[PDB]
Design an enzyme around this catalytic site. Sequence first.
Site, PDB file in Angstrom:
ATOM      1  N   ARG A 113      63.019  35.344  41.819  1.00 51.20           N
ATOM      2  CA  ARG A 113      61.920  34.568  41.255  1.00 51.20           C
ATOM      3  C   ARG A 113      61.353  33.504  42.187  1.00 51.20           C
ATOM      4  NH1 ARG A 113      64.446  32.361  35.947  1.00 51.20           N
ATOM      5  NH2 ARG A 113      66.451  33.110  36.847  1.00 51.20           N
ATOM      6  N   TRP A 282      60.332  44.313  45.516  1.00 44.20           N
ATOM      7  CA  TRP A 282      61.039  45.028  46.561  1.00 44.20           C
ATOM      8  C   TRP A 282      62.524  44.916  46.261  1.00 44.20           C
ATOM      9  CZ3 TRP A 282      57.741  40.956  47.899  1.00 44.20           C
ATOM     10  CH2 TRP A 282      58.374  39.705  48.058  1.00 44.20           C
ATOM     11  N   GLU A 287      71.266  46.805  44.987  1.00 43.50           N
ATOM     12  CA  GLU A 287      70.820  47.631  43.872  1.00 43.50           C
ATOM     13  C   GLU A 287      70.963  49.115  44.197  1.00 43.50           C
ATOM     14  OE1 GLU A 287      67.121  46.021  41.717  1.00 43.50           O
ATOM     15  OE2 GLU A 287      66.993  45.029  43.675  1.00 43.50           O
TER      16      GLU A 287
HETATM   17  C1  HEM Z   1      59.971  40.762  44.693  1.00 41.39           C
HETATM   18  C2  HEM Z   1      61.289  40.940  44.805  1.00 41.39           C
HETATM   19  C3  HEM Z   1      62.229  41.065  43.578  1.00 41.39           C
HETATM   20  C4  HEM Z   1      63.548  41.145  43.703  1.00 41.39           C
HETATM   21  C5  HEM Z   1      64.326  41.125  45.037  1.00 41.39           C
HETATM   22  C6  HEM Z   1      64.118  41.249  42.383  1.00 41.39           C
HETATM   23  C7  HEM Z   1      65.452  41.363  42.124  1.00 41.39           C
HETATM   24  C8  HEM Z   1      66.005  41.615  40.901  1.00 41.39           C
HETATM   25  C9  HEM Z   1      67.355  42.079  40.654  1.00 41.39           C
HETATM   26  C10 HEM Z   1      68.428  42.386  41.727  1.00 41.39           C
HETATM   27  C11 HEM Z   1      67.509  42.182  39.334  1.00 41.39           C
HETATM   28  C12 HEM Z   1      68.805  42.649  38.642  1.00 41.39           C
HETATM   29  C13 HEM Z   1      68.457  43.897  37.849  1.00 41.39           C
HETATM   30  C14 HEM Z   1      69.436  45.009  38.085  1.00 41.39           C
HETATM   31  O1  HEM Z   1      70.531  44.739  38.628  1.00 41.39           O
HETATM   32  O2  HEM Z   1      69.119  46.160  37.709  1.00 41.39           O
HETATM   33  C15 HEM Z   1      66.255  41.798  38.696  1.00 41.39           C
HETATM   34  C16 HEM Z   1      65.973  41.745  37.349  1.00 41.39           C
HETATM   35  C17 HEM Z   1      64.740  41.508  36.779  1.00 41.39           C
HETATM   36  N1  HEM Z   1      63.546  41.315  37.460  1.00 41.39           N
HETATM   37 FE1  HEM Z   1      63.361  40.848  39.425  1.00 41.39          FE
HETATM   38  N2  HEM Z   1      63.095  41.225  41.450  1.00 41.39           N
HETATM   39  C18 HEM Z   1      61.913  41.116  42.155  1.00 41.39           C
HETATM   40  C19 HEM Z   1      60.667  41.079  41.565  1.00 41.39           C
HETATM   41  C20 HEM Z   1      60.392  41.025  40.222  1.00 41.39           C
HETATM   42  C21 HEM Z   1      59.060  41.010  39.641  1.00 41.39           C
HETATM   43  C22 HEM Z   1      57.750  41.073  40.480  1.00 41.39           C
HETATM   44  C23 HEM Z   1      59.202  40.977  38.306  1.00 41.39           C
HETATM   45  C24 HEM Z   1      58.113  40.908  37.206  1.00 41.39           C
HETATM   46  C25 HEM Z   1      56.834  40.589  37.446  1.00 41.39           C
HETATM   47  C26 HEM Z   1      60.630  40.941  38.006  1.00 41.39           C
HETATM   48  C27 HEM Z   1      61.209  40.896  36.765  1.00 41.39           C
HETATM   49  C28 HEM Z   1      62.551  41.104  36.511  1.00 41.39           C
HETATM   50  C29 HEM Z   1      63.154  41.164  35.205  1.00 41.39           C
HETATM   51  C30 HEM Z   1      62.384  40.966  33.872  1.00 41.39           C
HETATM   52  C31 HEM Z   1      64.464  41.401  35.370  1.00 41.39           C
HETATM   53  C32 HEM Z   1      65.532  41.513  34.258  1.00 41.39           C
HETATM   54  C33 HEM Z   1      65.328  42.816  33.510  1.00 41.39           C
HETATM   55  C34 HEM Z   1      66.403  42.983  32.484  1.00 41.39           C
HETATM   56  O3  HEM Z   1      66.660  42.027  31.706  1.00 41.39           O
HETATM   57  O4  HEM Z   1      67.008  44.082  32.420  1.00 41.39           O
HETATM   58  N3  HEM Z   1      61.306  41.009  39.195  1.00 41.39           N
HETATM   59  N4  HEM Z   1      65.371  41.449  39.694  1.00 41.39           N
HETATM   60  C1  LIG Z   2      70.215  50.223  32.446  1.00 41.36           C
HETATM   61  N1  LIG Z   2      70.886  49.212  33.277  1.00 41.36           N
HETATM   62  C2  LIG Z   2      70.391  47.874  32.925  1.00 41.36           C
HETATM   63  C3  LIG Z   2      69.127  47.564  33.615  1.00 41.36           C
HETATM   64  C4  LIG Z   2      68.132  47.211  34.153  1.00 41.36           C
HETATM   65  C5  LIG Z   2      67.047  46.697  34.620  1.00 41.36           C
HETATM   66  C6  LIG Z   2      66.006  46.463  33.743  1.00 41.36           C
HETATM   67  C7  LIG Z   2      64.835  45.879  34.198  1.00 41.36           C
HETATM   68  F1  LIG Z   2      63.836  45.659  33.329  1.00 41.36           F
HETATM   69  C8  LIG Z   2      64.700  45.505  35.524  1.00 41.36           C
HETATM   70  F2  LIG Z   2      63.566  44.929  35.966  1.00 41.36           F
HETATM   71  C9  LIG Z   2      65.723  45.736  36.416  1.00 41.36           C
HETATM   72  C10 LIG Z   2      65.504  45.299  37.852  1.00 41.36           C
HETATM   73  C11 LIG Z   2      65.008  46.386  38.789  1.00 41.36           C
HETATM   74  C12 LIG Z   2      64.100  45.716  39.804  1.00 41.36           C
HETATM   75  C13 LIG Z   2      62.767  45.455  39.487  1.00 41.36           C
HETATM   76  C14 LIG Z   2      61.936  44.838  40.414  1.00 41.36           C
HETATM   77  C15 LIG Z   2      60.475  44.573  40.068  1.00 41.36           C
HETATM   78  C16 LIG Z   2      62.447  44.500  41.656  1.00 41.36           C
HETATM   79  C17 LIG Z   2      63.797  44.765  41.940  1.00 41.36           C
HETATM   80  N2  LIG Z   2      64.324  44.442  43.145  1.00 41.36           N
HETATM   81  N3  LIG Z   2      64.585  45.355  41.014  1.00 41.36           N
HETATM   82  C18 LIG Z   2      66.905  46.319  35.954  1.00 41.36           C
END
Ligand code: HEM
Ligand SMILES: CNCC#Cc1cc(F)c(F)c(CCc2cc(C)cc(N)n2)c1
Lengths: 411, 411
Positions: A113, A282, A287
Amino acid sequence: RFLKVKNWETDVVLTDTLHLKSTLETGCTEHICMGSIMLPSDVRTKDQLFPLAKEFLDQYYSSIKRFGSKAHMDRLEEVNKEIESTSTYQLKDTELIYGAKHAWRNASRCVGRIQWSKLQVFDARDCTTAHGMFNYICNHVKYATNKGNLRSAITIFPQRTDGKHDFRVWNSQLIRYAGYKQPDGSTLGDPANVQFTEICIQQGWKAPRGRFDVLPLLLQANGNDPELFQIPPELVLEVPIRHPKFDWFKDLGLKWYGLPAVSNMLLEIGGLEFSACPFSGWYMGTEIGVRDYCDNSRYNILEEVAKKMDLDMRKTSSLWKDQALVEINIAVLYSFQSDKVTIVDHHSATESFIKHMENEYRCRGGCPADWVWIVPPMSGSITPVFHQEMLNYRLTPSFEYQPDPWNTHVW
Amino acid sequence: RFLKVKNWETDVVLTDTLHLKSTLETGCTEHICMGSIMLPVRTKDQLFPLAKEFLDQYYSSIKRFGSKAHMDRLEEVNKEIESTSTYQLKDTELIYGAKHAWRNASRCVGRIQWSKLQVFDARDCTTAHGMFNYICNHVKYATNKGNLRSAITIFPQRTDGKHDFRVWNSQLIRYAGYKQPDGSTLGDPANVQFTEICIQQGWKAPRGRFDVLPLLLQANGNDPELFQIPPELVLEVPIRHPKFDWFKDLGLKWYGLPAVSNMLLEIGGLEFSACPFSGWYMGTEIGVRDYCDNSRYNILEEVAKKMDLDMRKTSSLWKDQALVEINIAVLYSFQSDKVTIVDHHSATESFIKHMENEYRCRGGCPADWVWIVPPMSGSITPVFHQEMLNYRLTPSFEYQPDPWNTHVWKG
Ligand code: HEM
Ligand SMILES: CNCC#Cc1cc(F)c(F)c(CCc2cc(C)cc(N)n2)c1
Ligand code: HEM
Ligand SMILES: CNCC#Cc1cc(F)c(F)c(CCc2cc(C)cc(N)n2)c1
Ligand SMILES: C[C@H](O)[C@H](O)[C@H]1CNc2nc(N)[nH]c(=O)c2N1
Ligand SMILES: C[C@H](O)[C@H](O)[C@H]1CNc2nc(N)[nH]c(=O)c2N1
Ligand SMILES: [Zn+2]
């Protein structure tokens, strides 16, 4: 009521007041903590909508330093009129951009974030059909990929009206690999997508039944039945996985896609619900290398890699799984970096998040954060976030989960 | 009411009813989760309900609930409270209570062993010299020439809070830390403050990197006294690596017996402020946290130098590489010297089996995911994928303030 979080590696203490503005609920109680539950927690009536709209417009006009102003009261009045009349309302472009950026800012499970304010918002609210959705998504994918110089983006399709005309992307991510149950017994490709891959075949798709077949898009417009589309292969940037030391690594046949693009979430802004809002950034290297490649329920390659490394797999205490895990994650970062595709390692990403937290506490009074999700799935305690106390709470605008559409679709 | 937890790797769902027996609070509310917060005087008034609830649990476990023995004991304890304002546990009740405090310790991954705890009753102790003798016998029993045995020694309970028994050491065996005038630290940086107290109390410090601290022991609320644990009772393991012969030249060792000595044991409303307990190490406690925390011995750099890894960018994962090699060396060394140790793969697999058994035989197993998941290689252990419910059961181990902050010095 005014809470403090300590970092136990640096003794830095931050005071959180932002949580007092929290609206929704956590699933915890004073008798039980549900902090490790994956998913804790329906038309919106005319009455619940206006307070939600007010709360949002209040924070929007505050953010532009026009709280209590001319334009503020007028806009409040105008949306109040539009809800009383039309039973809903429409966001100004400025409010939509603000709301999407703050949904990301508020995502307590997201370590990335620090980038929240540099989000490209594509307004797709004029879309009416699945072919139009496909067009908007191809443009998103191309914009965000940017020849490997990835750029964050979100595309926002029309908001829910009466729950019968929902826009939905049926895929969980825009780009994922297919999964097939073998007659021989096991699973070919990605086991996580076996059910979805079936709904693609059992709705039209001709699968190449391979190991890394990019799935087609299943797009639902205005509540109609969803339609299949192949993303142009030239728009899907993939990275072959090699190791900077082990020349046999290429023979494993591994690749992954460059663009992480979540498409099954719900964006809530000012009470309005955007059920189709694919967003992309990205990857953080773990991941792919830890979860996608080494989960037992996923591609589960640890044993094969360890064998090629000729590790002592007789006893767990040799830490052969841990050695292989590191090497796999070295290769992922090496491959993306070599092909000039944006990626961040977990040390850089978590250091960035600590800096982001300090920014948010200083300029906003807090940062909701979910430690269970923020700490990377390898080497947790050598990253700074492990030693950082975090408060988790729910702010709006927000991204929320929603049911998989096949379980809901009046077919 | 019932609550379900899901294992997302195996889809096994468990149902928790034990959380209904939870009385104490967690720190969380419906609006904030405090799950990653490190740390989230008693009269006759509140004591008999706490005693009754404990005795009900005790007599239920021995299949004697409602018996004449149960009713007589409730009567006896009631009269003892109203007459003396406290009460004494029977030996059987103390043993049950100590075992269940361990069973209830939601942050402890080693609980499969909870029923095999050796309870040493030291409630007849009156002086710091007597405490020293009890602690020596505990250390010798538990060490058992490397074949470690779990044990707890229980000193007299709190009375008016002005006569507490306390072990001022946080652990029975720990290495000194010395702050140098140039700002660097010799030994264990975590023990600098306590080391200075010992020195002030008359300890002649050798000023080396691995100096076993003296015991600082407080009996009956008196000023604490210094004692040196006989060196022949302190089992230590020199750390070497099975492939890297230069690793021994780092000069590392660690002690064999992890023995926590600063927690408070609560049983039926009684407070045992001095209750040292010991088990055996999980490898990562030493190899990840003790050696590799930036705030601890912090050997990643020198280890990575001797491995000649690319240390210029974090994305080489040189920190992760060295971390695994250090943890191989800890496990190899302990096993080679036949000192009990468990790797994090074995320990987390046993915890999952323990947890499933507890759900079936007990209706639940309170567990703190943030602490149960090991500090390296998190998601390749099965606990990472396991949903857990955290709630507080009694009997329990609780934190208490460091005694140097509360003690009234006699002089
Ligand atoms: C730009 C680089 C970004 C990186 C490196 C990043 C990284 C991550 C990682 C590692 C997770 C953990 C999810 C998992 O382990 O599957 C995550 C969750 C999440 N990301 Fe980010 N993200 C990025 C951009 C964004 C953007 C652009 C958005 C929305 C506009 C976003 C929204 C979310 C949300 C909502 C979650 C939680 C989803 C859930 O509750 O399952 N991310 N992110
Ligand atoms: C089923 N397993 C639980 C789960 C999950 C889960 C749900 C989401 F909405 C979500 F955004 C993510 C993160 C994947 C992600 C998204 C973005 C934009 C960047 C990033 N680098 N990585 C993971
Ligand atoms: C027998 C082998 C044991 C193993 C392998 C083990 C392992 C662990 C580990 C790894 C932790 C996390 C602590 C940290 O990271 O610093 C922990 C916490 C804890 N252990 Fe166990 N333990 C064992 C025995 C015991 C015994 C005998 C007791 C008590 C009788 C006990 C009580 C606790 C408690 C109360 C905690 C919580 C500590 C806190 O909240 O700070 N453990 N254990
Ligand atoms: C800021 N850090 C605070 C802390 C701590 C802490 C406190 C405790 F009571 C505690 F038991 C531990 C675990 C050490 C331990 C104990 C035993 C018996 C076995 C084992 N294998 N390991 C750690
Ligand atoms: C049960 C547990 O909550 C689950 O395995 C969580 C743990 N932490 C996670 N953290 C991230 N970033 N992503 C995940 O999918 C999970 N899974
Ligand atoms: C802030 C956070 O709660 C803190 O660093 C915790 C995280 N998990 C832990 N887990 C264990 N086993 N031991 C610890 O000391 C910690 N520290
Ligand atoms: Zn909680």
